[PDB]
């Protein structure tokens, strides 16, 4: 049933389409792309309807059941366009034994990536442009009259904006970017009611971010929660630039104060890590770097799995046998090239690495540490502030096939870590 796609333009569909699909099928459609190429996937037809517990289509950011799940679809609803620069996008088509449906029809394009203007990261991520789909926007709740839906929260939208069922600080507008993205800025508006002509706007809000949409981090500014100041009228746009660029997939806007009701229109700004030169995700997340390539110094519990160290995908983390081991005695090793950095994550009370060293090799037997000139010793990299939110740590491009991360300082819970390596082919 399974197929691989590498040609510039292609078609993907359920077996026998336009006929209804055969029962008890489990096929994988994998699209592969060269570095600097983006995968565009567009569905033309989709009928799987009967929890998708019968017939479903899974879209995977990487290898299925290794890389993160983008979405599961089982309706008459065509999935929205996807732009992947992971280099690999996979579909799993699962059919049951009852009521064969019409299936799905889709097409893909491999397009050369064009990095934005310089290497600027203030690109609108697609709220106004529609690049973010309606599917990608959700909310805690919506107003009863149904005239203020999450899908009306697009910046400069002409029909009200998003309003929740109640005005409280527990309500939020959520956007799933589908893939890990750099976030640098947020633009918000209020809304003047089409009916009453009443002006509703958020005066201040908090930012919550997640990589899986389960573990959340409130974007803190210092040691306390950052409270962004928003709009003072229902029409004018207010842009808040993040003082420290964020790496995330799920964005939540939680209003804290408002004028006469919560109304929100929104734009998100950022870019992809891959927009920067020689910054491809080398396969820890996607599963392109298989289990056989992941090793660690130690490992809490016998017969550990190597797919627990994967950045984002892993719903746990890497743990050393010793909870509290001495610095420089524990390490995670990846066998892969030019390496220009890593992305470090904590583990899902809570464990994350606060300072770390990096060592690299071509041999696997002779190792070097990235050296800070000032120290005359291996450079000491800033780690994470939080167990979920990843931190990208770039360094001077170094050629290697083996990379090790040595935890130096960590949270009171101890060493917990998930990891990706960044770089490109020679």
């Amino acid at each position, epitope marked *: 049933c399974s197929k691989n796609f590498t040609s510039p333009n292609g078609t993907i569909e359920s077996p026998g389409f336009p006929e209804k699909y055969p029962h008890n099928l489990d096929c994988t459609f994998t699209i592969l792309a060269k570095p600097k190429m983006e995968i565009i996937l567009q569905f033309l037809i989709f009928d799987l309807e009967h929890d998708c517990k019968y017939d479903w289509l899974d879209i995977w950011d990487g290898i299925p059941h290794v890389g993160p799940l983008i979405g599961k679809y089982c309706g008459t609803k065509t999935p929205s366009e996807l732009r992947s620069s992971t280099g690999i996008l996979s579909l799993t088509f699962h059919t049951d034994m009852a009521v064969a449906k019409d299936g799905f029809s889709a097409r893909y394009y491999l397009v050369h990536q064009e990095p934005l203007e310089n290497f600027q990261c203030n690109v609108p991520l697609g709220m106004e442009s529609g690049r973010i789909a309606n599917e990608q926007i959700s909310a805690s709740s919506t107003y009863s009259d149904g005239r203020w839906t999450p899908q009306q929260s697009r910046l400069h939208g002409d029909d009200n904006g998003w309003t929740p069922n109640l005005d409280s600080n527990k309500e939020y507008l959520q956007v799933d970017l589908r893939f890990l993205t750099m976030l640098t800025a947020i633009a918000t508006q209020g809304a003047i009611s089409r*009916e*009453t002509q009443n*002006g509703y706007y958020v005066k201040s809000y908090k930012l919550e971010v997640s990589t899986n949409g389960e573990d959340w981090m409130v974007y803190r500014h210092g040691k306390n929660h950052k409270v962004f100041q928003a709009n003072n009228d229902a029409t004018e746009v207010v842009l808040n630039k993040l003082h420290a660029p964020l790496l995330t997939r799920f964005v939540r806007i939680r209003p804290q104060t408002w004028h*006469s009701g919560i109304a929100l229109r929104l734009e998100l700004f950022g870019c992809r890590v891959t927009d920067a030169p020689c910054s491809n995700m080398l396969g820890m997340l996607s599963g392109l770097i298989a289990d056989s390539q992941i090793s660690a110094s130690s490992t809490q519990e016998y017969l550990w799995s190597p797919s627990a160290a994967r950045l984002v995908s892993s719903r746990s983390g890497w743990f050393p046998r010793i909870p509290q081991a001495q610095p420089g005695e524990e390490w995670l090793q990846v066998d892969l090239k030019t390496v220009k950095g890593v992305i470090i994550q904590g583990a899902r009370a809570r464990a994350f690495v606060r300072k770390f060293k990096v060592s690299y090799s071509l041999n696997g037997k002779d190792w070097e540490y990235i050296q800070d000139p000032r120290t005359q010793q291996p450079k000491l990299f800033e780690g994470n502030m939080h167990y979920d939110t990843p931190d990208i740590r770039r360094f001077d491009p170094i050629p290697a096939q083996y990379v090790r991360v040595y935890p130096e300082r960590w949270s009171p819970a101890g060493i917990g870590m998930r990891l990706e390596v960044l770089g490109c082919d020679w």
Partner: antibody
Amino acid sequence: EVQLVQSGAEVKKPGATVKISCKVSGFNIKDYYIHWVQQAPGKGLEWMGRIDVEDDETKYAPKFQGRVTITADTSTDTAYMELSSLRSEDTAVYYCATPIYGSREAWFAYWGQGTLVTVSS
Amino acid sequence: DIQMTQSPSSLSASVGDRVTITCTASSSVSSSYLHWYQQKPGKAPKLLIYRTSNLASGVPSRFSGSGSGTDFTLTISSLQPEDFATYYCHQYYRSPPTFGGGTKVEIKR
């Protein structure tokens, strides 16, 4: 319990101006919305206008435009309707009303008792 | 603007009787935006129903309303002497807000 208390009845000569008072109380809170309605003796409810108390963003009916000014004092929870260039037909009961907080549907939940203006010479 | 017309203007109906007042719109009003008010002779209007004539507010059970788009209704299942008043419908689907002419309920006795 939200309660609006209006000014007393007045007689005002034709071509004069009348300001009447709507004292919001009971639940109050900021972001109150005040609307003025005119009931002619004959009958009918006619919407003069509304005011965002926090932001001075009055909306007026085209009929009373030019001739009605709505003001809010945030310090004392009182809203005012000023009717310029009075007419014989302006003799009516003027009501002030407010909707509930979260209602984007703007039903007039609470009303004032009514102020009678008798435009007479 | 969207003009509102309440058809029956005067109703003499006896006590304990089912009465029905129409309200009808020049355009289409969203269900959630039609409201109803009761005005006793010497008093300010009081809210009866606030969404599509569906949602009654701390008020007697006899009062019902229904409708969609153009035609909305207010119904008193057992009319009572207390219920003698003028009844107004209001729309806030598009500003400016508009009221109906009113229906003056009277009682046979």
